Nucleic acid binder design. Structure first.
Ligand SMILES: [K+]
Ligand SMILES: [K+]
Ligand SMILES: [K+]
Ligand SMILES: [K+]
Ligand SMILES: [K+]
Ligand SMILES: [K+]
Ligand SMILES: [K+]
Ligand SMILES: [K+]
Ligand SMILES: [K+]
Ligand SMILES: [K+]
Ligand SMILES: [K+]
Ligand SMILES: [K+]
Ligand SMILES: [K+]
Ligand SMILES: [K+]
Ligand SMILES: [K+]
Ligand SMILES: [K+]
Ligand SMILES: [K+]
Ligand SMILES: [K+]
Ligand SMILES: [K+]
Ligand SMILES: [K+]
Ligand SMILES: [K+]
Ligand SMILES: [K+]
Ligand SMILES: [K+]
Ligand SMILES: [K+]
Ligand SMILES: [K+]
Ligand SMILES: [K+]
Ligand SMILES: [K+]
Ligand SMILES: [K+]
Ligand SMILES: [K+]
Ligand SMILES: [K+]
Ligand SMILES: [K+]
Ligand SMILES: [K+]
Ligand SMILES: [K+]
Ligand SMILES: [K+]
Ligand SMILES: [K+]
Ligand SMILES: [K+]
Ligand SMILES: [K+]
Ligand SMILES: [K+]
Ligand SMILES: [K+]
Ligand SMILES: [K+]
Ligand SMILES: [K+]
Ligand SMILES: [K+]
Ligand SMILES: [K+]
Ligand SMILES: [K+]
Ligand SMILES: [K+]
Ligand SMILES: [K+]
Ligand SMILES: [K+]
Ligand SMILES: [K+]
Ligand SMILES: [K+]
Ligand SMILES: [K+]
Ligand SMILES: [K+]
Ligand SMILES: [K+]
Ligand SMILES: [K+]
Ligand SMILES: [K+]
Ligand SMILES: [K+]
Ligand SMILES: [K+]
Ligand SMILES: [K+]
Ligand SMILES: [K+]
Ligand SMILES: [K+]
Ligand SMILES: [K+]
Ligand SMILES: [K+]
Ligand SMILES: [K+]
Ligand SMILES: [K+]
Ligand SMILES: [K+]
Ligand SMILES: [K+]
Ligand SMILES: [K+]
Ligand SMILES: [K+]
Ligand SMILES: [K+]
Ligand SMILES: [K+]
Ligand SMILES: [K+]
Ligand SMILES: [K+]
Ligand SMILES: [K+]
Ligand SMILES: [K+]
Ligand SMILES: [K+]
Ligand SMILES: [K+]
Ligand SMILES: [K+]
Ligand SMILES: [K+]
Ligand SMILES: [K+]
Ligand SMILES: [K+]
Ligand SMILES: [Mg+2]
Ligand SMILES: [Mg+2]
Ligand SMILES: [Mg+2]
Ligand SMILES: [Mg+2]
Ligand SMILES: [Mg+2]
Ligand SMILES: [Mg+2]
Ligand SMILES: [Mg+2]
Ligand SMILES: [Mg+2]
Ligand SMILES: [Mg+2]
Lengths: 37, 90, 166, 142
RNA sequence: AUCCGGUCGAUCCUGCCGGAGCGCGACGCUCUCCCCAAGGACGAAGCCAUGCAUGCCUCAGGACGCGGCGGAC
RNA sequence: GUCGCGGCGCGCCGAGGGCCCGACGCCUGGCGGAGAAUCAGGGUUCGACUCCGGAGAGCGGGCCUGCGAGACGGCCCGCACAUCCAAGGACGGCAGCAGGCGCGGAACUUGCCCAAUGCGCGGCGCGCGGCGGCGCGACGGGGUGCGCGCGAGUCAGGCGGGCCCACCCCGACCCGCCAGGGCAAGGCUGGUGCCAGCAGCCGCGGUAAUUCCAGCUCGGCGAGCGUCGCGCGGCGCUGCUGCAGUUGAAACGCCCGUAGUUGGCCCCCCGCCGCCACGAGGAAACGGGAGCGCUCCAGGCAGGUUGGA
């Protein structure tokens, strides 16, 4: 055990009903597609 | 306030009193106290209790014990209501 | 014991069995769009409140048209379903209860009623106006968006006399 | 009919079911009582103990790695277990006398994945949750 | 009154392993407002400092005491 | 002898009594029911704790007083443990309410009050019980905006309350937690190079990684999300409804045969079973269910001649 952590050591939107409204209008082709963003 | 009505009046000549339910109506404003509307419901023989205000306001319901004598009130009234009216204070 | 040990309580919604099904996942958000729904629980509640009135009818329909249980409970069920406006007068058959959908339940919410009479421009503006104690039912100020309005009490939905919009 | 019928055979139908119920491995494991005796945790969700050593364990055939684990002595029955430490760099919070809260891997007492002979895992070290120690929300004294 | 991933070069099966739901506790992280509400039971019926959990009414100013009912609920 | 019947005890006489329709013995991390968790129908599992019944008060025994106790906030003795002491003696029982130690993964204040519901004596008593405190075990409602007005807080007066507070009324100021190859909704840059690590199961990583560690973006549930263990479901993989037995696991080498299970057809209009239906009688709470706007709701039994069917 001398290697543990090797890679580790070497490396407001709207809320509630308004967030669901945002998703409703945003959706109504993939959500995280490359072409859109 | 301006509107005071009473129902469910029961005469009780065993406890020397009369029991009532009182409805108080004050649309828009408060009714300021029980000591205020005590005039509409002598005065010193009236025992007012159990008043609740509904949601939004405008309505209040309470209960009245109206005695006829004065010994009767010091005899048949709970010992903490006589202190809420200042009548004894011990 | 204490007296509070004798008080009842109950859960009022049922979660679905497969969470990650796409067609009902977007059908479930069209519903959150047409009505100002906070979260999925308010859909679940609705379905739960349907699943009971559907269980009653199917129990009575298995019975016979002249039994007293049908004559008593089906009449009670129909008389309750007509006052809330979940079911309408022209359908006074117990078999007309089975073809009911959730949308019929959602249409009698206060948030929906005030939109229909155009007191509010949309359903989101309606929810905001509900929270602001700006609307009264029969002279009684009601604060609850989810309030269920009976057909008797739908003539009498207004802005509250005590208000900053009066 | 390969099963007895007849209006007065309830006793036989019950005896057959009582006898053949024990043939299922799930029922026998959960109802016999030998697994409860042999269980290091004694039928509990979790258990605390002290660390006696730090170790590295080879993986199984198609994988190649050195997994990090600790030998633990149980407080309540003095048994010997080995428990796995997940979450990169977490083996560095485990001194040789560190009270550890230990739970299971899932699978109700079966080894998972590629770690031979490991059925338990550390969830808390010296009073502090190990996951929050990795996520950098709390820290150990010194 | 519903299934899905894993045995092969590919295929149809038997068969288990794994996943997906509800409940009860324990652990972690996190938390604005209001109503209801469980809370040392879980092979320790192990051990207990301190205070409180049972009193109320025939014969003389009163206590005190005697007598009485209760302390088995 | 007992309140009383009885092998309950004693003397005498006889040899009975129970059993594969499972006796006897052993084991139980065994209190029983009303009930609870799960969910097509049939079922499986659990019955610590609210009501009803039983048993106990460190462990054995014994007893007095009383209508009623084999009483432990009564007494006596043995044992195992503690207490004060001038050393002669005296003395204890929280599985009551708080509180502490120990143990465990795991569980709150050494508060105020007899105002209510009831009980003893009649006026009091009561850690029954009531009211506050701690309380993300769990339940229910509403927010973090809408196209321009609110709530959370602040300060006053009411109402309420044994006294204070919370709720309600009037007045003036003002997310998070898990993920992103498949099961299963959701994809570009840097680092690392079978190492570190991930991964319930398939699998990923060998110096171009859709999976490790990070950044951006996106997905799900949401004041709540993830992990561990267990019950039920999934499961027609326990099968009565309803499995399988040529070759996948599975028909005794064969014949006889008791208990057990099963047994053709026929008389109708009696008796005795079973069976079907309807009654009587006994507990409520829970579970269903008629009626009622605690602002809705989880609730409750309310209420405006009434009602709790
Ligand atoms: K068969
Ligand atoms: K069969
Ligand atoms: K058979
Ligand atoms: K038969
Ligand atoms: K069988
Ligand atoms: K099923
Ligand atoms: K396969
Ligand atoms: K093959
Ligand atoms: K297969
Ligand atoms: K305990
Ligand atoms: K106990
Ligand atoms: K246990
Ligand atoms: K437990
Ligand atoms: K204990
Ligand atoms: K007595
Ligand atoms: K006594
Ligand atoms: K005898
Ligand atoms: K004898
Ligand atoms: K003999
Ligand atoms: K037996
Ligand atoms: K036990
Ligand atoms: K069933
Ligand atoms: K069954
Ligand atoms: K059933
Ligand atoms: K089933
Ligand atoms: K309890
Ligand atoms: K008990
Ligand atoms: K009990
Ligand atoms: K009880
Ligand atoms: K009882
Ligand atoms: K009892
Ligand atoms: K008892
Ligand atoms: K007892
Ligand atoms: K005992
Ligand atoms: K004792
Ligand atoms: K004892
Ligand atoms: K004893
Ligand atoms: K004893
Ligand atoms: K007795
Ligand atoms: K005795
Ligand atoms: K005794
Ligand atoms: K004590
Ligand atoms: K106990
Ligand atoms: K207390
Ligand atoms: K401890
Ligand atoms: K501890
Ligand atoms: K009292
Ligand atoms: K008495
Ligand atoms: K108390
Ligand atoms: K405001
Ligand atoms: K305010
Ligand atoms: K402001
Ligand atoms: K404001
Ligand atoms: K304002
Ligand atoms: K990760
Ligand atoms: K698993
Ligand atoms: K799987
Ligand atoms: K797989
Ligand atoms: K690279
Ligand atoms: K099954
Ligand atoms: K089943
Ligand atoms: K089934
Ligand atoms: K078969
Ligand atoms: K074999
Ligand atoms: K074989
Ligand atoms: K074979
Ligand atoms: K055979
Ligand atoms: K055989
Ligand atoms: K034979
Ligand atoms: K034969
Ligand atoms: K034969
Ligand atoms: K035979
Ligand atoms: K026979
Ligand atoms: K048989
Ligand atoms: K037979
Ligand atoms: K036969
Ligand atoms: K019958
Ligand atoms: K009763
Ligand atoms: K009447
Ligand atoms: Mg003999
Ligand atoms: Mg029981
Ligand atoms: Mg019980
Ligand atoms: Mg208890
Ligand atoms: Mg006692
Ligand atoms: Mg005793
Ligand atoms: Mg512990
Ligand atoms: Mg609310
Ligand atoms: Mg089954």
């Amino acid at each position: 055990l001398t290697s543990a952590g090797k890679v580790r050591k070497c490396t407001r939107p709207p809320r509630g009903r308004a967030y669901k409204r945002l998703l409703y209008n945003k959706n109504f082709l993939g959500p995280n597609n490359l072409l859109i963003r | 306030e301006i509107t005071v009505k009473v129902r469910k009046v029961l005469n009780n000549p065993l406890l020397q009193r009369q029991q009532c339910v009182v409805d108080v109506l004050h649309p828009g404003c408060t009714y300021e106290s029980k000591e205020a509307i005590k005039a509409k419901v002598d005065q010193k023989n009236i025992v007012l209790y159990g008043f609740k205000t509904s949601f939004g306001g405008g309505h209040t319901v309470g209960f009245c014990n109206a005695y006829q004598n004065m010994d009767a009130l010091m005899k048949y009234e709970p010992g903490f209501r006589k202190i809420r009216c200042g009548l004894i204070e011990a | 014991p204490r007296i509070s040990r004798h008080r009842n309580s109950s859960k009022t919604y049922s979660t679905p069995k497969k969470p990650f099904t796409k067609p009902r996942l977007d059908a479930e958000l069209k519903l959150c769009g047409e009505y100002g729904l906070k979260c999925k629980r308010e859909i679940y509640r609705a379905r739960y409140m349907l699943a009971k009135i559907r269980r009653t009818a199917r129990n009575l329909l298995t019975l016979d048209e002249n039994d007293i249980k049908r004559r008593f409970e089906g009449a009670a069920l129909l008389r309750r379903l007509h006052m809330l406006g979940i079911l309408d007068e022209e359908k006074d058959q117990l078999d007309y209860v089975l073809g009911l959908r959730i949308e019929d339940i959602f249409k009698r919410r206060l948030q929906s009623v005030i939109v229909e009479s155009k007191l509010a421009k949309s359903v989101h503006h309606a929810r905001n106006m509900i929270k602001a104690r700006h609307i009264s039912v029969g002279g009684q100020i009601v604060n609850i968006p989810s309030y269920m309005v009976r057909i008797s009490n739908t003539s009498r939905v207004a802005i509250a006399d005590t208000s900053s919009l009066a | 009919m390969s099963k007895t019928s007849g209006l007065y055979t309830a006793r036989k139908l019950r005896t057959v079911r009582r006898v053949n119920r024990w043939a299922d491995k799930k029922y026998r494991k959960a109802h016999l009582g030998t697994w409860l005796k042999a269980n290091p945790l004694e039928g509990a969700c979790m258990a605390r103990g002290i660390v006696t050593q730090k170790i590295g364990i080879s993986a199984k055939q198609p994988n190649s790695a050195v997994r990090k684990a600790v030998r633990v002595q149980l407080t309540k029955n003095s048994k010997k277990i080995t428990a796995f430490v997940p979450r990169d760099g977490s083996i560095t919070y485990i001194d040789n006398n560190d009270e550890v809260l230990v739970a299971g891997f899932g699978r109700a007492g079966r080894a998972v994945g590629d770690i031979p002979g490991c059925r338990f895992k550390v969830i808390k070290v010296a009073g502090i949750g190990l996951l929050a120690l990795f996520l950098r929300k709390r820290e150990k004294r010194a």
